[PDB]
């Protein structure tokens, strides 16, 4: 059904695309420098560097600064992906996408300075409590549905959905971080990337694929939130891939009938049948019986009561994050990889 509510969504996305393309075509660059910030503590790590809590000297604001070593990016063949990441993040604008405040580079590193989201990773809370109730999981899932509706309308694919990347803010709502695999593409793409538990079968099998891989990954996320473990797990990645492509999924006995039905349609190997990829697009998902209680506009406006509010001891506190070994930020006296990253 295409009624008044659907036309409002359409008009909202049209204006959102006008604003995105202006920034996509004319990206911001070199908007701060390293000594504008005091470095406080590491919030997480990855293959190219680390995300650090920092304090902006001139305002006293706290931020999260992602640091990438240019030489390590080159060795991992992630140059173009890193240029994608920053060009996309500086252009997007949505309530559940973390905001990029500054970016710059020096002889050794690339820096993206984002809003600090103090509540910690969904991953931490999910592992500690075991599993979320279905209303809890539905609250978070609705935010991801709207965020993918926004991203996909801009021809963006996200490609790394997982609880490790979903931060909980002070109102209890989600902020998506890490756009290292995000890509703007019309038609199909072919890169083998993501996280093993969340890969769609068409990625594993080296087919061309499109935004339907994000909807598969949503199915994995909802399952993991409500069960406490992912639908395909093993000790070695090859064993995970064999389960993903097999065509078989089993559900905990406490999953509601509606939840199992939604997940059978999201975790669908047949692309002609996977929810999110049919003629009705995202509306097959938004109108599924499992989402009957979800007021999509109220979610977008952050007027729904959150399942929990993270503990907050004060500004700059990190109690909702694990501790990591601290390593220096070394800046070489010689410029590294300048031509490769000239547009950053």
């Amino acid at each position: 059904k295409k009624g008044s509510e659907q036309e409002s969504v359409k008009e909202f996305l049209a204006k959102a695309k006008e604003e995105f393309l202006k920034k996509w075509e004319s990206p911001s660059q070199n908007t701060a420098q390293l000594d504008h910030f005091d470095r406080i503590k590491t919030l997480g790590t990855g293959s190219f560097g680390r995300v650090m809590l920092v304090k902006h000297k001139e305002t006293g604001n706290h931020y999260a600064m992602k640091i990438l070593d240019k030489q390590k990016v080159v060795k991992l063949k992630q140059i173009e992906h890193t240029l994608n990441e920053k060009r996309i993040l500086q252009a997007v604008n949505f309530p559940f996408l973390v905001k990029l405040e500054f970016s710059f580079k020096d002889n050794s590193n690339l820096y993206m300075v984002m809003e600090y989201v103090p509540g910690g990773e969904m991953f931490s809370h999910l592992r500690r409590i075991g599993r979320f109730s279905e209303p809890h999981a539905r609250f978070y899932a609705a935010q991801i549905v709207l965020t993918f509706e926004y991203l996909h309308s801009l021809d963006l694919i996200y490609r790394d959905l997982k609880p490790e990347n979903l931060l909980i803010d002070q109102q209890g709502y989600i902020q998506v971080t890490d756009f290292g695999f995000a890509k703007r593409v019309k038609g199909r793409t072919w890169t083998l990337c993501g996280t093993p538990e969340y890969l769609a079968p068409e990625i594993i099998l080296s087919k061309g694929y499109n935004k339907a891989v994000d909807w598969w990954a949503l199915g994995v996320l909802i399952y993991e939130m409500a069960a406490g473990y992912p639908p395909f797990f093993a000790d070695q990645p090859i064993q995970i891939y064999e389960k993903i492509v097999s065509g078989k999924v089993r559900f905990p006995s406490h999953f509601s009938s509606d939840l199992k039905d939604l997940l059978r349609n999201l975790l669908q190997v047949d692309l002609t049948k996977r929810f999110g990829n049919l003629k009705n697009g995202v509306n097959d998902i938004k109108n599924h019986k499992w989402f009957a209680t979800t007021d999509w506009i109220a979610i977008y406006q952050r007027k729904v009561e959150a399942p929990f509010i993270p503990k907050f001891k004060g500004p700059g506190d990190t109690s909702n994050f694990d501790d990591y070994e601290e390593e220096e930020i070394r800046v070489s006296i010689n410029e590294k990889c300048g031509k490769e990253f000239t547009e950053f």
Partner: peptide, 18 residues
Amino acid sequence: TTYADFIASGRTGRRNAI
């Protein structure tokens, strides 16, 4: 139980991208 199998597995910590 499937939960007990997950908790004893090697992939309950943060998962790196490929």
